[PDB]
Amino acid sequence: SLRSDLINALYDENQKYDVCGIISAEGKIYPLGSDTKVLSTIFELFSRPIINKIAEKHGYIVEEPKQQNHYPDFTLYKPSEPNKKIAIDIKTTYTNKIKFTLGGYTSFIRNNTKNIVYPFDQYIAHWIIGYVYTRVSLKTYNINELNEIPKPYKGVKVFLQDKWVIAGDLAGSGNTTNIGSIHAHYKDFVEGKGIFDSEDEFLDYWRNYERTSQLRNKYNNISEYRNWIYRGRK
Amino acid sequence: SLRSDLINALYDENQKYDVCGIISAEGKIYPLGSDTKVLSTIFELFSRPIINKIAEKHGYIVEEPKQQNHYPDFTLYKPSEPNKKIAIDIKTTYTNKENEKIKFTLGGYTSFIRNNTKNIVYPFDQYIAHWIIGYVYTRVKSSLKTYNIIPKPYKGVKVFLQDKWVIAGDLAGSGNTTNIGSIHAHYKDFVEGKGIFDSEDEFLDYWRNYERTSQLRNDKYNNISEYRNWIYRGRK
DNA sequence: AAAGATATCTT
DNA sequence: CAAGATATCTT
Ligand SMILES: [Cl-]
Ligand SMILES: [Cl-]
Ligand SMILES: [Cl-]
Ligand SMILES: [Cl-]
């Protein structure tokens, strides 16, 4: 399928190549940074060719946001079926158990057209391509010195998983109100060992999660949410 | 001076090299993206070797943060002058059409500017200068495939070096992340330093007492004129 | 954990 | 403009 082919392609590309620098049209290479702000950017760009390739094999058009405040990184859809779009979002985190910030819980999930390339209800799947790298110069290089360029990571792993499956019940951020993923080992993300019973539960939980502890002290975790449901959503 | 040599070097490198892709150890090239998140990251990496070169030439050591939530991008200091550190911060913004007005988010106004050791590599009072290396690019299929040893994700790029206080404005650059906003002006105004504050001291006092929301600012000061009125009256 | 920093953009 | 979105980290 598109899904199986995409993750097979991502795995192989991750196994075969090591990004190590920024190259200019003149052939001068600048080494990379060892922080997430740098790597998250690189990992997405590294995934782009692969995503377009596989999508094309399966007859899907690939669209990227035209706005910088828009989710997702990639929108896939067949021109015949515009209402069955697939959102593919790249997320990154580091290790020296991990966790990811899975996007806002007050934007598109609460307003059908807020900060999203296409209305939320036009997407039938929301995939996360997660990159996990094990954390590790100030000079430039030429094409013959690629082997000398320090790689900003000791290792990198990649997985493709549905957003709802790896979602947790604790916010991933405060002021930027992000859904927090489960806090687990890489294996749990690949295997989809989450806490939500269904995507319906995931969505409802995050659509009704209060922004601060004061207000939440309703529900602060999955157990309290299930109780809130029993009480009649009050 | 370190400053004159640094801008000349940055300005020159900008003119002689065009960043165009991510290269792998195997020689495979991945095209760049055209958004600010990508380019701001690139422009900093592009600036790094130049900053280090010029700094070393003037006997300055360069130190980058050991963690993501610390300002500045680069801390320069001579061993002999530990309390005369120079913060150099890389900032980027874009323009749809070249020569349009631009604005930058000049860092938070509730971290190190209000607390000497909060979110900063070294205590704020050990720095005597806060420079901003500003990059402005005009925003701009081949970009979708990989290449061997490529369209550029920008039409043109301009760079300037200026003191933070000099290009500071009186309206916030961000809401929930409480950033100082720069003046909203053309590139040349940043180069020439046509800001609104009269001194670095006025800049600091203004941003140290700027309230977080329009509501609060409504009864104190929301702009420079109001701040000067607030000051005239006795800070009340 | 919960809240707010790390940079910049959009309506 | 304001305010809160776009990502992740720190504590
Ligand atoms: Cl993106
Ligand atoms: Cl992303
Ligand atoms: Cl940096
Ligand atoms: Cl920066």
Strand-pair category, A155-162 with A123-134: antiparallel
Cα–Cα distance measured from residue A32 to residue B90, given in angstroms and rounded to the nearest whole number: 16
> Which of B10, B16, B24 should be substituted to probe chain A, the one whose Cβ sees the most A Cβ atoms within 10 Å?
B24
- Does any strand D atom come closer than 7 Å to the Cβ of A221? no
SS3 track for chain B: CHHHHHHHHHHHHHHHCCEEEEEECCCCEEECCCCHHHHHHHHHHHHHHHHHHHHHHCCCEEECCCCCCCECCEEEECCCCCCCEEEEEEEEEEECCCCCCECCEEEECCCCCCCCCCCECCCHHHEEEEEEEEEEEECCCHHHCCECCCCCCCCCEEEEEEEHHHHECCCCCECCCCEEEECCECHHHHHHCCCCCCCHHHHHHHHHCCCCCHHHHHCCCCCHHHHHHHHHHCCC
Using DSSP, state whether A132 is helix, strand or coil: strand
Query: What interhelical angle do A36-57 and B36-57 show, nearest 10?
Result: 140
Which amino acid would we find at residue A37? Answer: K
The contacts of residue A215 (CB under 8 Å, 6+ apart) are none
Verify if strand D has an atom below 7 Å from the CB of A100: yes
| Of B40, B49, B61, B41, nearest in space to B12 by CA | B49
User: What is the chain A residue with the closest CA to B68?
Assistant: A35
Gap between the Cα atoms of A94 and A181, Å rounded: 14
Phi, psi of B173 (to 5 degrees): -90, -20
CA closest to D3 C1', residue: B175
CA of A221: nucleotide with nearest C1': C1
Phi, psi dihedral angles at A69 (to 5 degrees):
-100, 20
Amino acid (1-letter code) at residue A114: K
| Helix, coil or strand: residue A18 | coil
A119 burial (CB, 10 Å; 0-12 / 13-18 / 19+) is middle
CA-closest candidate to residue A131, choices A113, A155, A103:
A155
Q: Resolution, in Å, please?
A: 1.6
Contact by Cβ (8 Å): B121, B72 = yes
Give, as one character, the DSSP assignment of residue A32.
P
Backbone angles phi, psi at A5, to 5 degrees: -65, -40
Burial B169-189 (b: 16+ CB within 10 A, else e): bbbbbeeeebbbbbbebbbeb
Sign of CA dihedral B220, B226, B231, B234: negative
Half-sphere exposure in the Cβ direction for B137 (13 Å, CA) = 21
Contact B164, B88 (CB under 8 A): no
Which helix (H) or strand (E) segment is B86 a member of? strand B85-95
| A75 CB inside 7 Å of strand D | no
Residue A175, Cα to own-chain centre: how many angstroms? 19
Q: Minimal CA–CA distance to B89: which of B167, B170, B8?
A: B167
- Give me the phi and psi of B89, to 5 degrees please: -120, 130
Side chain identity at residue B50, one-letter code: I
DSSP strands (E only) in chain A? 19-24, 29-31, 61-63, 74-78, 81-95, 101-104, 123-134, 155-162, 178-180
Of A115, A232, A100, the closest CA to residue A166 belongs to A100
Is CATH 3.40.600.10 what the domain over A1-234 is classified as, yes or no? yes
For the record, the structure tokens of A54 come out as 């596989």
User: What is the CATH code of the structural domain delimited by B1-236?
Assistant: 3.40.600.10
